[PDB]
Design a protein around this ligand. Structure first.
Ligand SMILES: COc1cc(O)c(C(=O)N2Cc3ccccc3C2)cc1C(C)C
Length: 213
């Protein structure tokens, strides 16, 4: 048979759609904090599975290794983050990545117009959107125990898609692929990735491996 795959198209909650616009169509220095934000979500999802793990070891039969991979590809112009954390069910994605309103959205947008540092993004509960400071498209692949694997993808423009993922399986965790803008290729550079990591991510308690082409 010719392949047939299922897709669902969603609208970003109105206010999150505003934030994303602000984020993309405005200039901010200190963009490197996007990598700090990624690594912290990865680290939080890793905490989660490890906590569940204390009580139910079979929770790890989908993966015993707790770590975070970094993978820049200049050919594709992608920076990919990979962790072996808790993962996301379908609901988690939909409710966490765009559909549902965030308490922090209105305040953060205001704080930015008042001249606040883009770096505050995380504090206001919307740090995942820091990805659009450097990326024109973002793909999120995730696998949670007792559920299937999903792909979530957006180029912003107020919309996003979700689909049961047929691609390469990950046992468990989330993978985030950032398709960098052209002015932001500096984040595909090994030297700059190590510099950002060593500066902003030294509190992280899981090994970070950087794969270098
Ligand atoms: C790198 O971006 C991510 C990495 C992730 O592992 C995760 C993730 O799967 N989780 C689950 C979880 C559970 C408790 C607390 C936080 C989180 C985030 C998410 C992202 C971003 C796409 C938000």
């Amino acid at each position: 048979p010719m392949e047939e795959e299922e897709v669902e198209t969603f609208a970003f909650q109105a206010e999150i759609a505003q934030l994303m616009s602000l984020i993309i169509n405005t200039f901010y220095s200190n963009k490197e904090i996007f990598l700090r934000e990624l690594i912290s979500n990865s680290s939080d999802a890793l905490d989660k599975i490890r906590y569940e793990t204390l009580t139910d070891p079979s929770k790890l039969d989908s993966g015993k290794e707790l770590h975070i991979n970094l993978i820049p590809n200049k050919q594709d112009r992608t920076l990919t983050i990979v962790d072996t954390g808790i993962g996301m069910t379908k609901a988690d994605l939909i409710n966490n990545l765009g559909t549902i309103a965030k308490s922090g959205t209105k305040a953060f947008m205001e704080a930015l117009q008042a001249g606040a540092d883009i770096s505050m993004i995380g504090q206001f509960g919307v740090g995942f959107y820091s990805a659009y400071l450097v990326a024109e498209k973002v793909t999120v692949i995730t696998k949670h125990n007792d559920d299937e694997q999903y792909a979530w993808e957006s180029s912003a423009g107020g919309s996003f898609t979700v689909r049961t993922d047929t691609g390469e399986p990950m046992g468990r965790g989330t993978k985030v692929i950032l398709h960098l803008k052209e002015d932001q290729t500096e984040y595909l550079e090994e030297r700059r990735i190590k510099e950002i990591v060593k500066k902003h991510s030294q509190f992280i308690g899981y090994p970070i491996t950087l794969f270098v082409e």
